[PDB]
Chains A and B, each alone.
Chain A
Amino acid sequence: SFTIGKAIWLLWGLVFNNSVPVQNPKGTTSKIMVSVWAFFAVIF
């Protein structure tokens, strides 16, 4: 539940898929939002 302000450090990091341990999303909304974001990053 430490996704208070450090969402940028996961968000722009998973654009590149750097295999870096950043944060494990414990919320379903965050996981669906990452499934949108990284799938947009793949075609980007």
Chain B
Amino acid sequence: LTLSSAMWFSWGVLLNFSARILGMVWAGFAM
């Protein structure tokens, strides 16, 4: 469920190893 892990992370970022860099920049976009 790694795709489900990415979904459950991504839908929880905006709602509250370069993929982690895209996640932290997307958290900046979220805020």
Contacts and interface: CB of A to CB of B under 8 A. Distances in A.
Interface residues of B, number: 5
B16 interface: yes
B19 to A, nearest CB: 20
Q: Is the interface of B mostly helix, strand, loop or mixed?
A: helix
B15 A35 contact: yes
Contacts, number: 10
**Interface size, A (range):** under 10
Interface in B1-31: 8, 11-12, 15-16
Interface of B: 8, 11-12, 15-16
Q: Is the interface of A mostly helix, strand, loop or mixed?
A: helix
Interface of A: 17, 31, 35, 38-39, 42
